[PDB]
Design a protein around this ligand. Structure first.
Ligand SMILES: Nc1nc2c(ncn2[C@@H]2O[C@H](COP(=O)(O)OP(=O)(O)OP(=O)(O)O)[C@@H](O)[C@H]2O)c(=O)[nH]1
Ligand SMILES: [Mg+2]
Lengths: 165, 246
């Protein structure tokens, strides 16, 4: 049997959690904004020559319900928007929650600076993300675009690789 | 305004949680799901409710109020709403000649006659079905007749009428569901079973009626026929509304 991977996409409202997930799963860019309550997806992918079943939880941007998916989740994508400084600042608290709930520091994680196609609206320079990754003991870090498809697959594949290690 | 979070399950076990207010019809939830799932929007897509305890299931009709249907569910319910393709749901509108016992022109004439006149015409369906005895793994073959208002039968000793046909059940009082695993559970002669139950009933009850059919075709005929009788012109309008989105 192929291994199953429970992945959780986290971050503040409007950063592109849903857009990244739908681009990855269905190859469609979601232009219309509708705030998520909870969406889940199942997709079979090949990672390092092996078939993998990915269970992806696309979470609400804005309790006990948060604790549960952190307890259950195996890998976490912490997403901010490069166009919104506050969404970047919000991520420290999310990380702290995860590590506390998991009761460990070694949790599969990736820092994702989304909307990298909107270069003219950039507020969060790539060096901020790199510095945060450094603070988090060399946490995986990528800049992505759900619209252009840049580094979309890489987000989820990297989490699988971290879970495998 | 009453709001309800409804977790919708897809066939691949993916899910979408939607905020559904008290004014939403199944039609509205479907329109939302068409947008969110990026599906092909064909007329077979529907909301489908499953009752794991009773092991029954049915399509929502598109005009049904979603919050109202779910209001009957218990606090710790196992029931689920699914988003699935069910090609039987509008079978009469694609192939009316299969129920009213053909080219496009004559199909259209048949639907005009059956749905677009002063009153609907229900298929002239009758036949034997097996009726489960209350609380027993026992079945009795009986002859039933479909009418606009309900299912009828000829009282023991008397025959074809007129105002002497006794009513078995009135459709205003029940929803119609598929019965699952009735052969294993209740010794139904086949697994081609339909169930008539008041919407409120969520657990075993003498008032749930179990009907078993000799074959799949008979089941299809009765489920479609009963839905026509119960929902009438509304079902036709639902179909026209669905075609417009396809
Ligand atoms: N230009 C551009 N727009 C994006 C990108 N990703 C998301 N968006 C847009 O940003 C808006 C919000 O995206 P969502 O994916 O719905 O945001 P979210 O993080 O899921 O928001 P919540 O579910 O409310 O937490 C939508 O209008 C998207 O089309 C991207 O990479 N580039
Ligand atoms: Mg979202």
């Amino acid at each position: 049997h192929m291994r199953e991977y429970k992945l959780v996409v986290l971050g503040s409202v409007g950063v592109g959690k849903s857009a990244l997930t739908v681009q990855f799963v269905q190859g469609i860019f979601v232009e219309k904004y509708d705030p998520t309550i909870e969406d889940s997806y199942r997709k079979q992918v090949e990672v390092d020559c092996q078939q993998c079943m990915l269970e992806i939880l696309d979470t609400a941007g804005t309790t006990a319900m948060r604790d549960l998916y952190m307890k259950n989740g195996q890998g976490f994508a912490l997403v901010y928007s490069i166009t919104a400084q506050s969404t970047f600042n919000d991520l420290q608290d999310l990380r702290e929650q995860i590590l506390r709930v998991k009761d460990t520091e070694d949790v599969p994680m990736i820092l994702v600076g989304n909307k990298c196609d909107l270069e003219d609206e950039r507020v969060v320079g790539k060096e901020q993300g790199q510095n945060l990754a450094r603070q988090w003991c060399n946490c995986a870090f990528l800049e992505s675009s759900a619209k252009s498809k840049i580094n979309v697959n890489e987000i989820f594949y990297d989490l699988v690789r971290q879970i495998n290690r | 305004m009453k709001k309800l979070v409804v977790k919708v399950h897809m066939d691949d076990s993916s899910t979408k949680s939607l905020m559904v207010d008290e004014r939403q019809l199944a039609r509205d939830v479907l329109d939302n799901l068409f947008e969110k799932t990026h599906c092909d929007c064909n007329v077979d897509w529907c909301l489908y409710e499953i009752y794991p305890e009773l092991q029954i299931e049915r399509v929502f009709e598109d005009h049904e109020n979603v919050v109202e249907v779910l209001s009957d569910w218990t606090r710790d319910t196992e029931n689920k709403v699914l988003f699935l393709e069910k090609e039987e749901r509008y079978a009469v509108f694609k192939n009316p000649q299969n129920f009213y016992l053909m080219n496009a022109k004559n199909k259209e004439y048949l639907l005009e006659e059956s749905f677009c006149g002063t009153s609907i015409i229900v298929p002239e369906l009758e036949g034997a079905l097996y009726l489960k005895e209350d609380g027993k793994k026992s079945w009795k073959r009986r002859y039933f007749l479909l009418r606009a208002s309900g299912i009828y039968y000829v009282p023991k000793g008397k025959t074809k009428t007129s105002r002497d046909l006794a009513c078995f059940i009135q459709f205003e009082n029940v929803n119609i569901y598929y019965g699952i695993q009735c052969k294993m559970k209740y010794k139904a002669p086949t697994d081609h079973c339909f169930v008539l139950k008041h919407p409120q009933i969520q657990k075993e009850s003498q008032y749930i009626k179990y009907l078993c059919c000799d074959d799949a075709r008979t089941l299809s005929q009765w489920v479609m026929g009963i839905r026509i009788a119960k929902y009438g012109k509304t079902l036709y309008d639902n179909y026209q509304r669905a075609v417009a989105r396809a």
